[PDB]
Amino acid sequence: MKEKIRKKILLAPEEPGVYIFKNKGVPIYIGKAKRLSNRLRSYLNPQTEKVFRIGEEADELETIVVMNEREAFILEANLIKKYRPKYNV
Ligand SMILES: [Mg+2]
Ligand SMILES: [Mg+2]
């Protein structure tokens, strides 16, 4: 994983949000979190091959802090629909 992404993960707030791993400007995985910190840190110790791939392929990680879990739910759904990222089913 790129060092800048590891850094961003470790700095991420304990706040609801949506996260977007990207490669060459293209989202490759979009997810949501009740706490960005907790969810993003899970990528550092990959529990699945897919998690491993997402973290290795990415050259950028964008985070969007949201008002609450309700906003996380709909923002995530909308962005997945818009971008249909590689690693989202
Ligand atoms: Mg999701
Ligand atoms: Mg709420």
Resolution (A): 1.8
Distance 70 CA to ligand 2 centre (A): 5
Distance 3 CA to ligand 1 centre (A): 24
Cβ neighbours of 44 (radius 10 Å):
13
Q: Pull the structure tokens for residue 84.
A: 């249909």
Domain of residue 31 covers 1-89
Q: Pull the structure tokens for residue 68.
A: 């609450």
Distance 77 CA to ligand 1 centre (A): 8
Length of the chain: 89
Distance 30 CA to ligand 1 centre (A): 7
Q: Pull the structure tokens for residue 80.
A: 């997945």
Q: What's the CA gap between 31 and 63, in Å, rounded?
A: 10
Q: Experimental method used, please?
A: X-ray
The total number of structural domains that make up the chain: 1
Q: What's the CA gap between 27 and 70, in Å, rounded?
A: 22
User: Which residues neighbour 47 within 8 Å (Cβ) at sequence distance 6 or greater?
Assistant: none
Q: Give CB contacts under 8 A, 24+ apart, made by 74-78.
A: 75/18, 75/32, 76/18, 76/30, 76/31, 76/32
Q: What's the CA gap between 62 and 53, in Å, rounded?
A: 17
Residue type, 81: K
Helix (H, G, I), strand (E, B) or coil at 84: coil
Q: Pull the structure tokens for residue 15.
A: 């706040």
Q: Where residue 79 sits, what CATH number does that domain have? A: 3.40.1440.10
Distance 45 CA to ligand 1 centre (A): 18
